[PDB]
Structure 1
Amino acid sequence: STGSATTTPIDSLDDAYITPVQIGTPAQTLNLDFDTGSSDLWVFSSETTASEVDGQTIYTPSKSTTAKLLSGATWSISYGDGSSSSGDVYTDTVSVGGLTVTGQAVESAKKVSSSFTEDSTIDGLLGLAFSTLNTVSPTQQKTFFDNAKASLDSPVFTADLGYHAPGTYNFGFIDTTAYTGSITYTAVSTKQGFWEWTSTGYAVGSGTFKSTSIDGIADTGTTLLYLPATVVSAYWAQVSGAKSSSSVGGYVFPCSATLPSFTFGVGSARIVIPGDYIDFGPISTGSSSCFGGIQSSAGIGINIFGDVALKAAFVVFNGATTPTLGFASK
């Protein structure tokens, strides 16, 4: 089997991407944030504290003839941005772009933190990291990809995120029309539960490539590109007036600037992020200070190849017995 679904930016900055997902019988369609940096499929629901719902579409398990309470199971997750959610668990039928999993754990939110409530466009998350990170207790549950894998034509999914435009998540096949050149594959460590790999270096604009190993994670659920402070300083030093602002929380730059590109290495191959992809717009409405899309990871503990980087590539998440990642230009 295969599946193919369009993913759409939630706003004019590509702050996140939503993908329609069918849950239950008859189908209830929710727009979920596909997140290769986490491993829980959770949704706003009829159980979510009413004051914490503000415009999201909710899953109502009592209206699904295939929903079953997973007795005793609870979940609770905290994300790197400080947001969180928790609740109980149902199993139900879940379909993405024509690919159907029966018995998928659907984690129903009883509580969500303010940033979720405040984002009316995201109805929940669909985790695509390794199932060892799933938070369900006392019986850990599998991701949608893990449950579908055996049925797929090939045990892979691909992320093709757009810049200011829709893109595609495919399951079970590699669309050879969606990228240019060849796909370069690189090793993955699953020891932390992430799609963790080592970039071979970087360049700023037309500058020379610096060969240096950068361990990080391919994370579709993180907006920006988080890299070591040395790398980030070298980038912003090429932008007149750019500075790190403790009060804003990162590097800012004059909105009048033209940003240089940023290149990262994948083995001997190179992915080029155009300068425009690094502009996240005014820090507050009407400001002439703009927020940068490349930020320091120094306070995180891990480097993160978020959407800013991934949207410049066609990315293969290869879930073969020894997983690997593939990157192509497009």
Structure 2
Amino acid sequence: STGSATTTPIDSLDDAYITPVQIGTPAQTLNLDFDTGSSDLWVFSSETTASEVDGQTIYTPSKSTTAKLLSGATWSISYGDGSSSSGDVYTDTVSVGGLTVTGQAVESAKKVSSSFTEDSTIDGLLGLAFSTLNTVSPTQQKTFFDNAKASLDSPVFTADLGYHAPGTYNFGFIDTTAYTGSITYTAVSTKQGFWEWTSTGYAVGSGTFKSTSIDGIADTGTTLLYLPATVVSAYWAQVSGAKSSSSVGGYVFPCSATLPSFTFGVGSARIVIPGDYIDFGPISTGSSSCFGGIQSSAGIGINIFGDVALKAAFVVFNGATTPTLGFASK
């Protein structure tokens, strides 16, 4: 089997992407944030505290003939940005772009933190990291990808995120028309539950490539590109007026600036992030200070190849027995 679904930015900055997902029988369609940095499929639901729901579409398991309470199971998750959610668990039929999994754990939120409530466009998350990170207790549950894997034509999914435009998540096949050149594959460590890999270096604009190992995770659920302070300082030093602002919480730059591109290494290959991808616009409405799309990972404990990086590439998440990551230009 295979599946193919369009993923759409939630706003004009590409802060996140939502993908329609069918849950239950008859189908209830929710728009979920596919997150290669976590492993829970959770949704706003009929059980979510009413004051914490504001415009989201909810899953109502009592209206699904295939929903079953997973007795005794609870979940609770905290994300890198400080947001959180928790609740109980059903199993139900879940389909993405034509690919159906039966008995998928669908984690129903009883509580969500304010940042979820405040974002009307995201009805929940669909985790695509390794199932070892799933938070369901006392019986850990599998991700949608893990459940689908044996059925898939090939045990892979691909992320093809757009810049200020829709893109595609495919399951079970590699669309050879969706990228240019060849896909370069690189080793993955699953030891921490993430799609963790090592970039071979970087360049800023038309500068020389610096060969240096940068360990990081491929994370579709993180907006920005978080890299070591040395690398980030080298980048922003090429933008007149750029500075790290403790008040704003990172690098800002004059909105009048042109940004240089940023290149990262994948083995001997190179992925070029155009300068415009690194512009996240005014820090507040009407400001002439703009927020940078490349920020320091110092104090995160790991580097994060988030959407800013991933959307410059066609990315293969290969879940074969020995997982790997593939990157192509597009």
Question: Could you state the TM-score of these two structures normalised by the residue count of structure 2?
Answer: 1.00
Quote the Cα distance in structure 1 between the aligned partners of 2:186 and 2:308.
Answer: 19
| CA offset digits 1:119-173 (Å, max 9, x no partner) | 0000000000000000000000000000000000000000000000000000000
Is residue 135 of structure 2 the alignment partner of residue 135 of structure 1?
A: yes
Quote the Cα distance in structure 2 between the aligned partners of 1:43 and 1:246.
Answer: 34
* Aligned-partner SS, 1:150: coil
Identity of aligned residues (%): 100
* Aligned-partner SS, 1:238: coil
TM-superposed CA distance for 1:45, in Å, is 0.1
| CA offset digits 1:60-110 (Å, max 9, x no partner) | 000000000000000000000000000000000000000000000000000
Quote the Cα distance in structure 1 between the aligned partners of 2:115 and 2:229.
Answer: 27
Quote the Cα distance in structure 1 between the aligned partners of 2:64 and 2:299.
Answer: 43
Aligned residues, how many?
Answer: 330
Quote the Cα distance in structure 2 between the aligned partners of 1:154 and 1:147.
Answer: 13
* Aligned-partner SS, 1:180: coil
Quote the Cα distance in structure 1 between the aligned partners of 2:62 and 2:250.
Answer: 45
Quote the Cα distance in structure 1 between the aligned partners of 2:301 and 2:74.
Answer: 28
* Aligned-partner SS, 1:151: coil
TM-superposed CA distance for 1:218, in Å, is 0.1
| CA offset digits 1:263-312 (Å, max 9, x no partner) | 00000000000000000000000000000000000021110000000000
Quote the Cα distance in structure 2 between the aligned partners of 1:2 and 1:151.
Answer: 8
* Aligned-partner SS, 2:149: helix
Quote the Cα distance in structure 1 between the aligned partners of 2:247 and 2:326.
Answer: 38
Quote the Cα distance in structure 2 between the aligned partners of 1:155 and 1:205.
Answer: 36
The corresponding residue for 2:188 is 188
The corresponding residue for 1:42 is 42
Quote the Cα distance in structure 1 between the aligned partners of 2:129 and 2:316.
Answer: 13
Q: CA RMSD in A?
A: 0.2
* Aligned-partner SS, 1:308: helix
TM-superposed CA distance for 1:33, in Å, is 0.0
Question: Could you state the TM-score of these two structures normalised by the residue count of structure 1?
Answer: 1.00
Quote the Cα distance in structure 1 between the aligned partners of 2:51 and 2:280.
Answer: 30
Quote the Cα distance in structure 1 between the aligned partners of 2:73 and 2:32.
Answer: 22
The list of structure 1 runs, each at least 4 consecutive aligned residues, that deviate by more than 3 angstroms after superposition, is none
Quote the Cα distance in structure 2 between the aligned partners of 1:274 and 1:235.
Answer: 13
* Aligned-partner SS, 2:150: helix
Quote the Cα distance in structure 2 between the aligned partners of 1:309 and 1:205.
Answer: 15
TM-superposed CA distance for 1:174, in Å, is 0.1
Unmatched 5+ stretches in structure 2: none
Quote the Cα distance in structure 2 between the aligned partners of 1:302 and 1:209.
Answer: 22
| CA offset digits 1:156-200 (Å, max 9, x no partner) | 000000000000000000000000000000000000000000000
Quote the Cα distance in structure 1 between the aligned partners of 2:281 and 2:15.
Answer: 11
* Aligned-partner SS, 1:33: strand
Quote the Cα distance in structure 2 between the aligned partners of 1:34 and 1:93.
Answer: 17
| CA offset digits 1:235-282 (Å, max 9, x no partner) | 000000000000000000000000000000000000000000000000
TM-superposed CA distance for 1:204, in Å, is 0.1
Quote the Cα distance in structure 1 between the aligned partners of 2:2 and 2:133.
Answer: 25
TM-superposed CA distance for 1:25, in Å, is 0.1
Is residue 254 of structure 2 the alignment partner of residue 250 of structure 1?
A: no
The corresponding residue for 1:239 is 239
Quote the Cα distance in structure 2 between the aligned partners of 1:72 and 1:142.
Answer: 17
Quote the Cα distance in structure 2 between the aligned partners of 1:301 and 1:112.
Answer: 26
The corresponding residue for 1:222 is 222
* Aligned-partner SS, 2:31: strand
* Aligned-partner SS, 2:233: helix
| CA offset digits 1:219-249 (Å, max 9, x no partner) | 0000000000000000000000000000000
Is residue 168 of structure 2 the alignment partner of residue 159 of structure 1?
A: no
Quote the Cα distance in structure 2 between the aligned partners of 1:283 and 1:299.
Answer: 22
Quote the Cα distance in structure 2 between the aligned partners of 1:104 and 1:72.
Answer: 16
